[PDB]
């Protein structure tokens, strides 16, 4: 739409008067525009680091050109599928690509990374290797994928304001992972049978491998301390998991915010402006290193026109010009408010709208306070007044309860006497019109202005309508032609009436905003409110609308879902190893990964935002995938071989090193930027990045010496008696 506006305008520009430019205040477009493209840079560029790790581990060109050209194939294919599925490109649908670029480097590695061995078994045969490696690997790729699905899909199955946000990760990755496997059975096999095939250098791993292959098994022996270490690392999470607070989406610096300025009811237009200025000026002078523009607007009510409110679209610089969190919309607009609320005799204030949060996490509640019986305005005021009152006595918990700006203002009745008037031969009509033509405008009909029909209004020159004593100027011709003056058939009296009438759902309402600030639970607040909302005089009902409509509605338990995911990760696993017992070998990794993540997320100032589950599932699962291939090589290097006890686990955990260390360092070093990122869209990037990288390292090694125990711990302890 913005494309169009901006080009509609275009067609204009050539024809307006002289010196008449369009400047461009608060626009939200470009941030989206820069934003999703600052993410594109990530993929694009992380296809580069992955090309280099796929080098320090392989040391060929054309043998590298093969796994690195996989992801770019898969990804592109995702975009098609996305489109198929009537979806769009946008943040969610992109991070879900990023988090997914793990799941692609790996599946490629894994394959070539294996036809890399067996070329240490067959002297010199390419097609023989790649092929041999396949088969003894192909039905393994199919299965992981058929099981990672579930580590994804049972999200984006709980709908609500949210859910549809998850469904985007889900689908993106459930596919694009599938493309992985088609690439895997098509591109990566051949093509790595096409173009496949320093004493203190290479020898690094290989020397340090046996050292690994040694340290293993030996473990949990004449000290069973390791199988306990799990229960520790486990009870490890669960702690920290309840300590780490959760959130939907991390508010970001779009490069623009606005400032309210609602004075109290009945202020003057001329004063309202004063306040506006000053805001217009504070920004101008002080935070001028940031504030690139200020479109001050007065008269403009966000909940309806008014001579008492106003608005300020403030517009920043290119971010790049504003390094460190001090130049963030958050800080900018923090001190910005402290400065106001000072020298301002009106409730001014500035704030950064929460991205993607068309009501999702506006933090707090709407409590419309309806008048359920013939009550009326006054009573209702009162009844609110009470409920508002108590609100205050319980600040024990975090609260900040309050109305919206319907505060009753002085009004000036004028009561026409229909007798005296007809008695003087004045008509009521003639009166009415005169009253409210001079004091209330009236638009007679349409004149024409240089070929554009326009409106025509009769009304009193300002100066003859400003205080009650002017109603002293208007006479009104009677039927005797004698000019008679209002003070002859009328009389006035100040009183109190209301400048806004709310109703909600057909009944008179009154909106009460409010939050449960840092400390308590958004569900307590409600509870509490509901509680004291049952005292107020008889006839007063209440209700939720908005963020609170959607509180009591849309919460479709995760764990309650994520369990159906266990059951399916299991039966799948079993399915795969044919054992109601082998699969615990792998499920047991789960913890080793989210151990990292519920850390670093705690280490960095971070939350349970989305982007955390995505970087939580991308490991939870990836982790359980490198663990399959290291529990699959056993039961095999065991059931289809001359080996067994630890002889099984032997060349298994032995072979599962180069791949692990390669993928794990293929991804991590790739997600590098994300973690400490510049500033534009950072919010999203940083959170994705810290939860992954710090949950990768923490399940790469801390799992590499750890699955093996499981496996044995598993089936050895199923042959006991």
């Amino acid at each position: 739409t913005a494309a169009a506006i901006r080009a509609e305008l275009a067609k204009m520009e050539p024809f307006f008067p002289s010196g008449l430019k369009i400047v461009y205040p608060y626009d939200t477009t470009p941030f989206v525009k820069i934003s999703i493209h600052e993410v594109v840079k990530t993929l694009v560029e992380a296809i580069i680091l992955v090309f280099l790790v796929m080098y320090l581990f392989l040391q060929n060109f054309r043998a590298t050109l093969i796994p690195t050209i996989a992801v770019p194939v898969v990804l592109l294919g995702t975009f098609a599928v996305l489109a198929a599925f009537g979806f769009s490109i946008n943040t969610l649908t992109m991070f879900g690509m990023v988090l997914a670029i793990g799941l692609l480097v790996d599946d490629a590695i894994v394959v070539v990374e294996n036809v890399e061995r067996v070329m240490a078994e067959e002297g010199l045969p390419p097609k023989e290797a790649t092929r041999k490696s396949m088969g003894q690997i192909q039905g393994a790729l199919v299965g992981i994928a058929m099981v990672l699905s579930a580590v994804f899909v049972p999200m984006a199955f709980f709908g609500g304001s949210t859910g549809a946000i998850y469904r985007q990760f889900s689908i993106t990755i459930v596919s694009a992972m599938a493309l992985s496997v088609l690439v895997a059975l098509i591109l990566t096999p051949a093509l790595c049978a096409t173009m496949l095939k320093f004493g203190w250098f290479n020898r690094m791993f290989e020397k340090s491998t046996h050292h690994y292959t040694d340290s293993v098994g030996g473990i949990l022996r004449s000290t069973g301390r390791y199988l306990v270490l799990y229960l520790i690392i486990v009870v490890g999470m669960a702690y920290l998991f309840v300590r780490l607070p959760s959130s939907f989406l991390p508010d970001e610096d779009q490069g623009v915010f606005m400032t309210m300025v609602q004075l109290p009811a009945g202020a003057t237009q001329e004063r309202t402006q004063k306040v506006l200025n000053e805001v217009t000026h504070y920004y101008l002078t002080k935070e001028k290193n940031n504030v690139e523009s200020v479109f001050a607007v007065n008269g403009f009510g966000f909940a309806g026109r008014g001579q008492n409110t106003g608005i300020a679209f403030v517009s920043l610089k290119d971010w790049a010009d504003r390094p460190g969190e001090e130049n963030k919309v958050e800080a900018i607009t923090m001190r910005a408010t402290r400065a106001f609320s000072q020298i301002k005799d009106a409730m001014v204030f500035a704030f950064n709208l929460p991205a993607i949060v068309e009501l999702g996490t506006a933090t707090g509640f709407d409590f419309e306070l309806i008048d359920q019986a013939g009550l009326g305005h006054e009573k209702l005021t009162q009844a609110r007044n009470q409920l508002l009152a108590e609100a205050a006595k319980h600040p024990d918990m975090l609260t900040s309860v309050r109305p919206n700006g319907l505060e009753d203002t002085p009004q000036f009745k004028i009561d026409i006497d229909q007798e005296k008037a007809q008695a003087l031969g004045v008509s009521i009509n003639d009166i009415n019109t005169t009253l409210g033509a001079a004091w209330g405008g009236s638009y007679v009909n349409d004149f024409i202005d240089r070929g554009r029909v326009k409106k025509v209004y009769v009304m009193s020159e300002a100066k003859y309508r400003m205080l009650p004593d002017d109603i002293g100027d208007w006479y009104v011709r009677a039927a005797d032609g004698q000019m008679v003056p209002f003070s002859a058939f009328s009389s006035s009296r100040w009183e109190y009436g209301s400048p806004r009438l709310e109703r909600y759902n057909g009944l008179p309402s009154m909106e009460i905003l409010g939050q449960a600030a840092p400390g308590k639970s958004t569900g307590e607040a409600m509870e509490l409110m509901e509680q004291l909302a049952s005292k107020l005089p008889t006839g007063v009902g209440y209700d939720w609308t908005g963020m609170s409509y959607q509180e009591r509605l849309s919460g479709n338990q995760a764990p309650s879902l994520y369990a159906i995911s266990l059951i399916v990760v299991f039966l799948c696993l079993a399915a795969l190893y044919e054992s109601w017992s082998i699969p615990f070998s792998v499920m047991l990794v789960v913890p080793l990964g989210v151990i990292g993540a519920l850390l670093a997320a705690t280490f960095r100032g971070l939350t349970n935002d989305v982007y955390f589950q995505v970087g939580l599932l991308t490991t939870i699962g990836l982790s359980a995938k490198n663990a399959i291939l290291i529990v699959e090589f056993a039961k095999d290097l065991m059931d289809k071989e001359g080996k067994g006890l630890i002889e099984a686990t032997l060349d298994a955990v032995r072979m599962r090193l180069r791949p692990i260390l390669m993928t794990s360092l293929a991804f991590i070093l790739g997600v590098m930027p994300l973690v400490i990122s510049t500033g534009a869209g950072s919010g999203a990037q940083n959170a994705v990045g810290t939860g992954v990288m710090g949950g990768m390292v923490t399940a790469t090694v801390l799992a590499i010496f750890f699955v093996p125990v499981f496996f044995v711990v598993v089936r050895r302890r199923f042959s006991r008696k």
Binding site: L435, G440, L467, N505
Partner: protein
């Protein structure tokens, strides 16, 4: 015709704006402000319902009135407020006491 009014102007609106709730026809009728003409007694005063109506129509009506400190105000101006003018008959005593 006491409760009908209740349901009509106390419950028929939400129900009919309720979920799944298509149309919602009401057995009974909201409260009207029924004024009953008397033929001979109207006659007794040289008066037709025409005058009656006339009356009603100017005795009981709402009437916009503008605002002291109007829309664009003179340079100074401090005071700004509406100017409630003539207004609707909420009771039934007034409907009774209208001047014919």
């Amino acid at each position: 015709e006491d409760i009908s009014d209740y349901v009509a102007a106390n419950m028929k609106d939400a129900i009919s704006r309720t979920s799944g709730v298509g149309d919602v026809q009401l057995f009974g009728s909201q409260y009207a402000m029924r004024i009953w003409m008397n033929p001979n007694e109207l006659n007794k005063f040289q008066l037709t319902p025409v005058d009656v109506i006339t009356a009603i129509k100017a005795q009981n009506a709402q009437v916009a009135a503008g605002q002291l400190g109007g829309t664009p105000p003179v340079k100074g101006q401090q005071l700004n407020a509406s100017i409630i003018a003539q207004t609707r008959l909420t009771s039934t005593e007034e409907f009774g006491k209208i001047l014919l």
